[PDB]
Structure formats: C-alpha cells, structure tokens
Amino acid sequence: NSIQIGGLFPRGADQEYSAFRVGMVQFSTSEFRLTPHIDNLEVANSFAVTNAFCSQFSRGVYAIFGFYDKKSVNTITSFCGTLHVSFITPSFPTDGTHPFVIQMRPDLKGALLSLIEYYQWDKFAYLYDSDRGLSTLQAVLDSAAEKKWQVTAINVGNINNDKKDETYRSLFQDLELKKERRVILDCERDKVNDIVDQVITIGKHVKGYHYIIANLGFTDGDLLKIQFGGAEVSGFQIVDYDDSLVSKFIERWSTLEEKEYPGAHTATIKYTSALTYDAVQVMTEAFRNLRKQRIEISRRGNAGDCLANPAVPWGQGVEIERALKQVQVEGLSGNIKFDQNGKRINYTINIMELKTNGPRKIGYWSEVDKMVLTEDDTSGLEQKTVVVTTILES
Amino acid sequence: NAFCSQFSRGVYAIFGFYDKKSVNTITSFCGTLHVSFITPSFPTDGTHPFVIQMRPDLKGALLSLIEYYQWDKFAYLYDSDRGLSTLQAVLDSAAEKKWQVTAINVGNINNDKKDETYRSLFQDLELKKERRVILDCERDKVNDIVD
Amino acid sequence: QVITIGKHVKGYHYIIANLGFTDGDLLKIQFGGAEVSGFQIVDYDDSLVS
Numbered sequence: 001n002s003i004q005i006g007g008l009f010p011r012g013a014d015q016e017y018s019a020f021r022v023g024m025v026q027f028s029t030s031e032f033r034l035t036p037h038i039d040n041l042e043v044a045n046s047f048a049v050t051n052a053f054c055s056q057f058s059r060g061v062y063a064i065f066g067f068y069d070k071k072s073v074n075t076i077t078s079f080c081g082t083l084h085v086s087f088i089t090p091s092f093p094t095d096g097t098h099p100f101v102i103q104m105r106p107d108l109k110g111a112l113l114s115l116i117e118y119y120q121w122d123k124f125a126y127l128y129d130s131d132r133g134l135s136t137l138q139a140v141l142d143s144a145a146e147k148k149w150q151v152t153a154i155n156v157g158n159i160n161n162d163k164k165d166e167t168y169r170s171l172f173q174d175l176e177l178k179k180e181r182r183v184i185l186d187c188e189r190d191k192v193n194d195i196v197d198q199v200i201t202i203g204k205h206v207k208g209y210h211y212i213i214a215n216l217g218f219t220d221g222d223l224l225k226i227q228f229g230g231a232e233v234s235g236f237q238i239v240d241y242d243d244s245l246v247s248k249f250i251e252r253w254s255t256l257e258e259k260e261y262p263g264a265h266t267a268t269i270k271y272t273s274a275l276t277y278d279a280v281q282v283m284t285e286a287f288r289n290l291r292k293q294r295i296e297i298s299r300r301g302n303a304g305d306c307l308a309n310p311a312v313p314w315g316q317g318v319e320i321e322r323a324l325k326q327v328q329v330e331g332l333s334g335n336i337k338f339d340q341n342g343k344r345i346n347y348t349i350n351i352m353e354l355k356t357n358g359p360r361k362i363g364y365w366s367e368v369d370k371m372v373l374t375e376d377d378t379s380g381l382e383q384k385t386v387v388v389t390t391i392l393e394s
Numbered sequence: 395n396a397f398c399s400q401f402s403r404g405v406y407a408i409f410g411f412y413d414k415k416s417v418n419t420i421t422s423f424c425g426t427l428h429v430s431f432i433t434p435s436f437p438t439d440g441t442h443p444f445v446i447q448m449r450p451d452l453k454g455a456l457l458s459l460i461e462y463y464q465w466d467k468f469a470y471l472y473d474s475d476r477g478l479s480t481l482q483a484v485l486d487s488a489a490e491k492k493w494q495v496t497a498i499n500v501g502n503i504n505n506d507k508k509d510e511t512y513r514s515l516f517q518d519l520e521l522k523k524e525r526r527v528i529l530d531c532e533r534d535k536v537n538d539i540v541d
Numbered sequence: 542q543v544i545t546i547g548k549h550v551k552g553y554h555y556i557i558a559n560l561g562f563t564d565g566d567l568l569k570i571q572f573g574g575a576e577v578s579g580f581q582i583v584d585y586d587d588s589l590v591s
C-alpha cells in the first residue's frame with residue numbers, strides 16, 4: 001500500500017521538514033506507507049506555487065501538505081477547491097470557509113481578545129505584521145468599537161530592514177504622544193525578536209510596560225533578554241511541554257543528530273514545526289480510517305494536466321476530505337479535532353506570563369469556556385493586616 | 395485558466411479585472427511570462443511589473459480631504475474588497491496626525507439578515523457620538539449604507 | 542550588567558575612570574538615556590593622530 005502525497009516546504013523550513021520526517025518515522029505502519037514528494041519553492045511566489053501544485057497533481061497525489069503566504073493562499077484554496085484536492089497546512093487559518101483545506105493552526109483571535117479583557121485594557125498599541133493577514137487586526141478593531149477601546153494600530157511590517165532604526169525611534173515617538181505603556185506584538189517569531197531587541201535598547205522594557213506576544217509560540221522566542229527588565233510580558237503557548245506526550249517527544253527530539261535533522265537538537269520546538277508533526281499523524285489516521293471503512297480511492301499518476309478544461313474533479317477526493325476532517329487524535333498541540341470546513345475545534349491554548357523564574361502558565365483558553373485561570377495565585381500579599389482594639393466611648 | 399487560455403491563443407496584451415483574491419495570480423503570471431496586463435481595477439499594493447493600472451491612487455486625495463475639514467475623530471467603514479491599502483493609510487496617518495479612527499469592517503455583513511447588524515453598527519458609533527463617517531466601499535455597498 | 546538590570550536609563554550618570562573612553566563599546570549604553578562621561582588621551586582630531 002503506497003500512498004503518494006505532496007509536500008510544499010518553503011525554503012528555510014528546516015525544523016518544519018525535520019519534524020515532518022520524524023512524523024513519517026513515528027507514524028509508519030506495515031498496513032501502508034506514505035510517499036512524500038518534496039518541493040522546495042518560494043511560498044510567496046504565487047506562480048511557483050501554482051506549478052508545484054499542478055506538478056504534484058500530475059504525479060497523481062491523494063493529498064498535499066504545505067504552506068502558503070498572504071499572497072499565495074488564494075491560489076491554494078482555489079485550486080484545491082476546484083480539483084477536490086485536500087490540502088493540509090500548519091499556516092495561518094483561512095479567512096472564511098474554504099473546502100478541501102485542513103488547518104493545523106487554531107484561531108488565536110479568540111484567545112487574544114479574552115486576554116485583553118482579563119488585564120482590563122482600554123487603551124493599547126497594536127503593532128501588527130501583514131504577513132499572516134489582517135484577520136486579527138480587524139478582530140481587535142471591530143471589538144474596539146463594542147468594548148470601546150482606543151487602539152493605536154501600526155503596521156510594523158513594511159519597515160525596510162537595511163536602515164530600520166530611524167523608523168523604530170519614530171515609532172515609539174508616536175507611542176509616547178499618548179504615553180502608550182501597553183503594546184501588543186502581532187508578529188512572527190523573527191519580527192518579534194527584532195522589536196524586543198529595540199525595546200531593550202530604548203529601555204522601554206522596564207517596570208510600567210506590558211507586552212503581549214500575539215502568537216502560538218510564546219516560548220519559541222528568546223525571552224531571557226526582556227525577562228529581568230521589569231516590564232510584564234504575556235503570550236500564548238500551544239505546545240504544552242508539561243504533557244507526558246510532548247515531554248516524551250522532546251526526550252527523543254533533543255537527542256536527534258542536528259546534522260541529519262537541522263535545528264532539531266533543542267529542548268523546545270516552534271509551534272509551526274509541532275503542527276507539521278501533528279499533521280503527519282492526522283494524514284495517517286485519515287488514510288487508515290479509509291482502509292478500515294472499505295473505501296477504494298486508489299488511482300495512478302495520470303490525473304492529467306490541472307489546467308484541463310473542462311476541469312473534472314475526481315470523486316475519490318470527496319472521501320479523502322471526509323476522512324481527514326473526521327480524524328480525532330492526541331498530538332503535541334493538544335486535542336486535535338475538526339469541523340466540516342477544516343478549522344480546528346475543541347482545542348486548548350495556554351495563557352502564559354513571564355515571571356522572574358521564567359515563563360509560567362496562568363490558565364488556558366477554550367473555544368467554549370473562554371479564559372479559565374489555573375492555580376498560581378501567590379496568595380497572599382502581606383494581607384496580615386493590623387488588629388486595632390478600641391472601646392465604645394463618645 | 396482564462397490567462398493561460400488567452401496566452402496559448404498567442405495574445406500581445408491582456409485587458410481585464412482582478413479581485414483582492416485573484417490579483418496575486420495576475421501580477422505573478424504577467425511578471426513571469428512578461429505579458430502586459432491593463433486593468434481599471436484597484437492599484438496593486440507594491441511595484442508589480444507588466445501591469446498597467448487605469449485607476450489612480452485615491453489614498454492621497456482622501457488623507458488631504460480629512461485635513462481640509464480638520465477631522466480628529468471619525469468613523470471609517472471599510473470594505474475588504476479593494477484591499478486594506480487605504481485602511482492602512484488612514485491608520486498609519488492616525489498615529490502621526492493623531493486621529494481617533496473607529497475602523498469597522500462593513501464587508502463581512504451577511505446580506506440575508508443584514509439589519510440587526512446595522513442597528514448594532516450605529517450603536518457603537520453612538521458610544522462616542524460619531525457624527526463624521528468615511529464610507530470606503532463600492533458603488534453598491536454605499537447605496538445600502540446610505541439607505 | 543547595567544543595561545540588563547536597566548540602570549542605564551535617564552537619571553543615572555556614569556564616569557569611566559580611564560584614559561580610554563572611546564576604547565570600549567559605548568553603542569550599547571549610548572541610547573539608554575543615562576549620561577556617560579570619561580577621559581580620552583588619544584585625540585583623534587589631531588592631524589598627527591589622524
């Protein structure tokens with residue numbers, strides 16, 4: 001049983017591919033083997049993505065795992081919908097209901113808005129990056145109307161990096177007109193470190209400031225720098241290293257040879273990579289539920305040209321979708337479940353705060369229970385008041 | 395398909411339209427295949443070669459008009475159809491010129507029950523007693539709002 | 542260490558008691574805010590040194 005699948009990995013996704021390989025090994029069975037056809041292309045380039053898709057389609061694949069950018073996302077969602085091809089991706093969730101797309105990344109929009117109310121914020125700065133779509137930006141802006149917030153949104157993305165200093169100085173110059181002390185960083189693991197470094201340089205990392213890293217990888221970045229500064233830093237973590245499941249994964253991951261497995265000799269793992277590993281498990285359980293369900297879907301490498309007109313969708317694809325979307329297993333990113341569209345449901349996102357001793361989970365966020373705080377209260381706080389005795393005498 | 399079809403037919407230039415979703419496809423192919431693409435649609439957010447845009451950039455004219463009326467606090471109802479290029483414009487300028495902009499995506503409003511949404515829309519535009527609104531929409535979405 | 546604990550912001554004043562003020566890296570505590578003074582024996586403004 002040889003199931004051929006496509007793999008679209010953006011140049012530079014070393015740890016992601018390394019995690020993709022480890023998944024192939026951990027979830028390899030005798031019942032059937034997955035044959036990944038890897039294609040390293042510039043994910044941003046829409047044209048290239050189109051070729052890589054039609055190429056993997058002519059090779060006759062049953063499913064495709066890859067990534068997309070804010071620019072190429074429309075290409076994938078469109079083709080996969082027309083050709084009834086299933087596309088599994090750890091990338092940011094699609095802004096809508098696009099069929100034949102499985103998204104490993106849970107929606108953070110909800111967890112973010114809940115955290116803001118927890119700290120009871122009414123006026124804050126929102127530094128965003130247009131890389132993962134303004135889906136979360138619209139979220140905070142729309143909620144700013146209802147909850148009545150004074151949000152200062154600033155696109156920290158289009159900043160040219162070969163002279164990006166007179167821009168940051170002019171950035172926190174506007175964030176001083178209103179004396180902004182509460183900032184939300186909605187950026188990638190990289191753009192965050194750049195900002196964090198600048199923050200320390202200008203000294204805006206001392207007590208009084210409060211930063212919120214708007215990503216699923218709070219511990220993915222270096223925090224040792226703004227850890228002793230004084231400013232409170234909060235964020236979100238999807239990979240709970242306290243789970244015996246994840247703890248066991250790291251035990252083998254941290255030992256792997258960094259030569260064969262690039263950027264894999266660490267005690268931690270980027271949430272993007274962790275989702276890639278969980279993606280393999282989903283594809284395995286999906287193709288397995290098709291064998292046990294007595295469903296024939298097999299074909300050959302003659303699907304033909306994807307530009308074929310009229311384009312006829314192979315009916316066997318409809319079943320492959322109902323398989324992946326029906327999958328429900330336990331992975332590094334907590335309980336994995338899907339709806340009819342492909343968006344993850346019944347998941348859990350741990351809310352993190354950065355203390356002196358390091359990061360610490362102060363609670364979690366459920367799509368049905370909102371935010372729920374867990375034990376951690378430093379009870380008490382010198383509450384030991386003073387007992388004053390007195391007599392009733394006018 | 396329509397692009398590759400017209401390309402196989404051996405054309406010298408292509409005139410058409412694109413959406414916020416298909417725009418990347420056109421700009422990419424036309425750049426790779428060195429095919430010229432003339433379009434009246436919204437200008438591309440960047441410098442994409444082999445693309446001729448008939449529509450001038452309104453971003454500039456809008457910002458200038460705001461200062462003319464001397465606006466400091468206004469509501470900005472936008473539609474994600476023509477890209478948030480102008481939205482980013484007013485938001486970025488809101489930092490410099492110090493404006494209190496209330497941006498609201500009036501696009502994702504489902505039209506088969508779009509009434510309890512408008513009532514809840516001007517309910518938020520009443521918390522701050524917004525009297526100055528900017529409608530960044532198509533000729534159609536504008537009439538709906540105006541009505 | 543000063544930068545780490547954040548004692549390099551406005552309000553602090555350091556004096557480097559050596560003849561090599563520009564000999565060390567100052568780009569780090571340069572934008573901090575705290576005033577830093579010192580001593581220089583090698584004048585790079587002299588045509589001789591230049």
Ligand SMILES: *[C@@H]1O[C@H](CO)[C@@H](O)[C@H](O)[C@H]1NC(C)=O
Pocket residue numbers: 335346
């Ligand atoms: C929802 O998720 C929880 C936590 O993983 C799980 O225990 C439960 O079975 C799920 N609910 C259903 C009905 O699938």
